[PDB]
Amino acid sequence: SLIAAHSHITGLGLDENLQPRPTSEGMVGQLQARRAAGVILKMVQNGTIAGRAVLVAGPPSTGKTALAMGVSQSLGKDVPFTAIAGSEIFSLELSKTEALTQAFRKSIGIKIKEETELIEGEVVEIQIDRSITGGHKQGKLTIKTTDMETIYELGNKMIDGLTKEKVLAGDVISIDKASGKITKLGRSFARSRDYDAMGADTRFVQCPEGELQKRKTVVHTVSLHEIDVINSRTQGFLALFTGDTGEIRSEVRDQINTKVAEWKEEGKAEIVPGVLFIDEVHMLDIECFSFINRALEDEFAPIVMMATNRGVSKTRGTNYKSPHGLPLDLLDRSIIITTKSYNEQEIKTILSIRAQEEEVELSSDALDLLTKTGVETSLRYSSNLISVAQQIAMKRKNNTVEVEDVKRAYLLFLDSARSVKYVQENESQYIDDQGNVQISIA
Amino acid sequence: KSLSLIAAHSHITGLGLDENLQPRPTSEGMVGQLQARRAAGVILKMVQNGTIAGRAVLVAGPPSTGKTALAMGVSQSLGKDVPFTAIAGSEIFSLELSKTEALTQAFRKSIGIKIKEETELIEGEVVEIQIDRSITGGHKQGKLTIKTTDMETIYELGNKMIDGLTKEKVLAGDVISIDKASGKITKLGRSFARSRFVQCPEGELQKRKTVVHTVSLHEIDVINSRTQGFLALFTGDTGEIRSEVRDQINTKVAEWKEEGKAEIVPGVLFIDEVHMLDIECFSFINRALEDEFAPIVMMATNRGVSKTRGTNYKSPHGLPLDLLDRSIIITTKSYNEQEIKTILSIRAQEEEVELSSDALDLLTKTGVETSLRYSSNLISVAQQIAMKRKNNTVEVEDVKRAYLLFLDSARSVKYVQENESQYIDDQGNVQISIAK
Amino acid sequence: VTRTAAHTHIKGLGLDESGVAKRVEGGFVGQIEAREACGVIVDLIKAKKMSGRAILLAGGPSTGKTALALAISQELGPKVPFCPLVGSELYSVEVKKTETLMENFRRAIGLRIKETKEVYEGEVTELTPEDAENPLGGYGKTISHVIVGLKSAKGTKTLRLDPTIYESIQREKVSIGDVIYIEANTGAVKRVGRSDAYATEFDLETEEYVPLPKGEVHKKKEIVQDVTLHDLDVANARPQGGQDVISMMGQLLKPKKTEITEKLRQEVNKVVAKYIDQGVAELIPGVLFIDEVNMLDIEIFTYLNKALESNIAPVVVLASNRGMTTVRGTEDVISPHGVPPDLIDRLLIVRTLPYDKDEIRTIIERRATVERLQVESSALDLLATMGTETSLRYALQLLAPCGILAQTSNRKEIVVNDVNEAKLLFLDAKRSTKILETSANYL
Amino acid sequence: KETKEVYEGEVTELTPEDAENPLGGYGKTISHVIVGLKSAKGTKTLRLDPTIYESIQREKVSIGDV
Amino acid sequence: FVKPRRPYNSEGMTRILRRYEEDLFCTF
Amino acid sequence: DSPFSFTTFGKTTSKFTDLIYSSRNPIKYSLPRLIYEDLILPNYNNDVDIANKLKNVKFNIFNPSTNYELCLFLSKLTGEPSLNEFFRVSTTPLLKRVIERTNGPKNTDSLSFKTITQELLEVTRNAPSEGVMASLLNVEKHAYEREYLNCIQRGYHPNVSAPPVTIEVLGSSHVTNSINNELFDPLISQALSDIPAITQYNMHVKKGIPVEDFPKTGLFPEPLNKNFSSNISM
């Protein structure tokens, strides 16, 4: 795909004793935060307990979302990771409580075990009996292998399966009964007399030998939010993709919880917990916090990881300052991970890792001056300067970024403090807070 | 019918007044407030005469002093077949209806039209049915014999009543009411034959009965709006009924009243906690109160020199003075110890609670000390403590245990002021830890 | 084996026959006066006579208010309906908060019913429809009647279908060689599946096979259903289930909450009254729980002042943790617990008290028992002095990192060095606030 | 990017050929459909599937159309 | 003993046969 | 396990047995005769029909007899070869415009062209599998067949099922015929159903009615599973 901001991290980089290495899996430094994240990862992988809120706090450009996405990468497949921003809750279709309920229910996973029958063979006879209007469709199918020969009965969805990507009595097809998948493997008959209607170049296959019908235990992972969207109304599968699911009633969720408990008792399904990650949680109303206050105390709740770069500040919807932008009720029932700022060698190793991720070769002195700029200014400016210096490097037709390219990139593109100083030296040129601006240069 | 467990004003069955509009000391479950009860009786005769309309009455007083009790007494003494709409101040801030449109709906819901019509019905006891059918069922003939406790008959039926009898299947021994005009078959039940259960009807088989119909203005406004049917009366999506349809309804009710086929009954609209309305609602109300088809509006409030919502100034009772010029005000007062004791005795007889006399005096003392509602709420808890120790009569220490267990307002304010360090203040500061 | 989350160690109030609460029994520690008051209100709702009774649970954070409501819910049992709610749930974008308030008010009144069902069931043997004389006349259906032959155990019945019944026959896609279920109250039809009287493995549509149904074709069975008044209200508001046009067109439309008028509620109440007078239904009042009532605003409180005076409202329980807090939606007035005094006058406040060191220690001990964890005595004393030092909840949620850090050292017990590692790894509120005050760039 | 194999032009003849062994209880059983097409400096007859004639009848294809 | 097949009953309906060597379309 | 039937129907107090649909709502909205006669149905003393004509036909802005220039303008806009189509659109309800929609031809010299999204839609009707446009346009059925959704069970059922509220008027049959026509409209109910195959064979061959003169059927959306097609659980 495309090289993103967090494309250099594959996992957390931890030992078997949960001791993080100083340079592993794209992570350097942040040893205590990575240790706490590995503890919370083993807690989620254990899956015994639920409803615990984790806070990652620190200054901007420190590694909050990098740590959260590394937790997601080490979490692996078939475990849900709902990563939403804090601004997504404010909507004109769903209430804040309903949107947060959906965000909670998206992170709880149901693994259902199903039994399948696989049919593969050379087809002999297909008879399709349709009505005049084409509504009532029934049929017979004759499938064979080298040893057996069976004649089946066809339904509407099966006939619509055979109608698409048409099978012409001599192709080898694959049918899953529980899934309804029609997969034409190829053609073995090799009929000489073919009409000039289709440009088929179907590869020659061989007619399969042995047992025609075989059993297979299959499994799949689904989550609760699509379950109560499906059970909500008649066309829940379309509302799953259009997102047009407006305020599902409480009886639907109650009966879905009862059915999930029954499925856990019967051994058909087991619940796999996941993690809901709310990036930049300080932009939430106090109603959202008061709903989270109760919704963290349910059995059907995931581990909530919330990140805040704010210090002591005013909570939204109120008129008092609070630590981390959150009321003390949420800080009463949450354990907080605190991140710390970086050093010279950590920033240099971060720039080396990002340059190897961006396949841009850097010289030693260029790396030193980039680390100098990332110590003086922030880390993100020195991160974003690399591709610009690379473009300057092939602009002079050499695949090595020296001092002069990074110096030219430094002159061409401005910082935050440099832009603040250049605005404040020329305040009459810009539109001020009072809306007065001097346009004429005379 | 009309299921109800026990309500707060369920002991009030009407205004206790004599034929000269004078209040009894204790009648129909109401004590105290003699002049307020006299004024509400004047309002009752004002509505019962019905010759005037569009008069607004404000009921103001201290909280927990006989306001909603007075309105419930007026509603109970009005009786049936008179429209009575009881809304709150917060029921008009809708998201699909506007505030003035909702006020127009609440105004037109309290004016009814009395219609008298007759419909001949056949109701009797089914003895024997005969059904003859062909192979294709094209021609059907049938005999129905049916009876009362007085007469006997046999009826030859056409094919459509045959189809309407095999639908909603009528057997022998059944009591059926038959409508000739619309073909509606209603099964009242089975009669008294041991071989549910109802009695066999008496008198004539083909009875002509009249009925007295009541229909509000709002029902005809919903029906005559062709964009939605009569399902909007139940679903509630009337959705901004226009004005020309209201003009047609207002002309046609006068056209019906001049021909004598209908009569208009006026009702009472009660807007409880009227101080929670916005200024734009009151501004609609001053011009809505001068209509011909406007009811008598009863409004209750308890605020005193409060800020009117939607403005920035303060007004008496939360209402601006232009509205107060169009209103006549009934004022209630506080209660003595004897009236509180009488109210508590009435609520004790109502909830089937047996008391000791010293416990009643203790309840009267703690009622005149703290609140009437606190004493009226402890009287149900103390009965449960009395049944927890297996005795019927509620004694003094039974009330004392409920007083110790269950808290009142001012005591709770006192411990909040004492232990405010463990609570969340207005600034969001709390202390959780017990040490340091 | 099992899953727990901050609760479910509370099983009930844990009282005697006389209502006297013990010290530690049933997962509860202390709070004897509050537990006795909760036993009183549990006996009150079990008395099934009162309507519109309200209490408020007053206390600090982490003192056991919601635990008391859950204990009330488990002491009442699953049969009496319990409606948990949060003060922020009343704000809907679809419908005003007044209708949401009586939405949850009518959701908390239970009802049983004993309903007779007229059932035709069996195996279909033949499917012969007959046609009309003129089908393209515009008015009237294409067919007139459909003959169905139902076969069951010891009996065979032949029925003449209406066309309207035949539409709901066709929509579930029946055929000869099937088992069906005609339900005559609504015309609803269940396709039970293919019978085992024919072959089994010759299908391709993952069907399941049902034996021939016992008993006669025509039946009358008794079914006990538990129901609320709210389900009746929303079924009559959006009518689905019939065999008309509107019944199909309501099942395909988007469901949306609507402002239910009082007239349908009065008619539904009259129908429930005529059901309870014939000895079929029995009325179950319930408990409505609103946590964080301070987040309710002034018009919801003003409407609740009317809602408590109805003759159908259930027992409502409120909870708050504010001392001297102005009401939301107003500008200047200050009232206790964020609840205006005209509603405070209708309440029965229940105090909740904080705990001591030994109560925190035995709560942590029972919690570590419930999550199947083993603690040393010195580590338990360190957890208790931390729970007195910072908060009960911080010590309560710190024990699962002690379990993980004890597991990762191939150990079973929890030691003091392990607790110190969990101390250094995870922070609390006070240390984070001290870090925020001594911070360089809003760290 | 994609590859399309198309046939287009004015229809010259349109005759659904019958089968050598017709089935009882039915009418005009079809073994194949013969359609002739003409265009600019090109004319070529086709041999089609029998089910295609149903789509020809639904799309209302007479003689002399493109 | 073997258990008999479900009755196949298709009256007044079109038919499509796909053999090895030739296809059919029995219509009305 | 079934929803509670909030209905009253004909029950038996116990060569064929005929069962007729008779489900009604227990809630009855009783309405007088005077309102229905004097405000809905026209008579000599009211002007319902005259006002309906004057609002719908005479002063209709799409009338070709009076606004032929506007009809020509909209015909050049839409490219539709009939000028009376705007009148028929504006004067029939929604579902009547739905269920007899015919894909008629529009002339090329017009301004309503083919939208790129509509062209992307129209490409992939009869396109088979392993085509790039079809596979890019068939995400939802791929998710249907991969998540094994066609064999899933049903977990939620409604608690109460009720018919619509029956309005009764004592002493009039016209209201009964109107209500029966509105509840059981044969055109819509035929659109929400299908014709039996032997009945179709009696239409086409034995009676000579062609296929395109059939009433439109089969517009009901299919349920997700066979289990989701009903509310009664075994």
Ligand SMILES: Nc1ncnc2c1ncn2[C@@H]1O[C@H](COP(=O)(O)OP(=O)(O)O)[C@@H](O)[C@H]1O
């Ligand atoms: N330990 C680390 N390993 C890899 N990248 C890091 C690390 N710490 C910080 N970063 C980089 O710094 C940035 C941190 O900002 P962000 O992820 O938004 O979290 P926060 O806002 O908490 O600092 C990310 O873009 C990430 O690429």
Ligand SMILES: Nc1ncnc2c1ncn2[C@@H]1O[C@H](COP(=O)(O)OP(=O)(O)O)[C@@H](O)[C@H]1O
């Ligand atoms: N005259 C009276 N007779 C009987 N009960 C009364 C009387 N006045 C007040 N009450 C009781 O006092 C309580 C408060 O009355 P209400 O009018 O509803 O409150 P408010 O005065 O705040 O509107 C009610 O429960 C009612 O039973």
Ligand SMILES: Nc1ncnc2c1ncn2[C@@H]1O[C@H](COP(=O)(O)OP(=O)(O)O)[C@@H](O)[C@H]1O
């Ligand atoms: N009496 C008690 N016994 C055991 N645990 C308690 C007791 N009281 C409170 N707790 C614990 O304290 C936590 C907070 O209780 P809860 O009522 O849910 O919130 P709050 O007390 O803040 O309203 C709960 O998780 C519960 O485990």
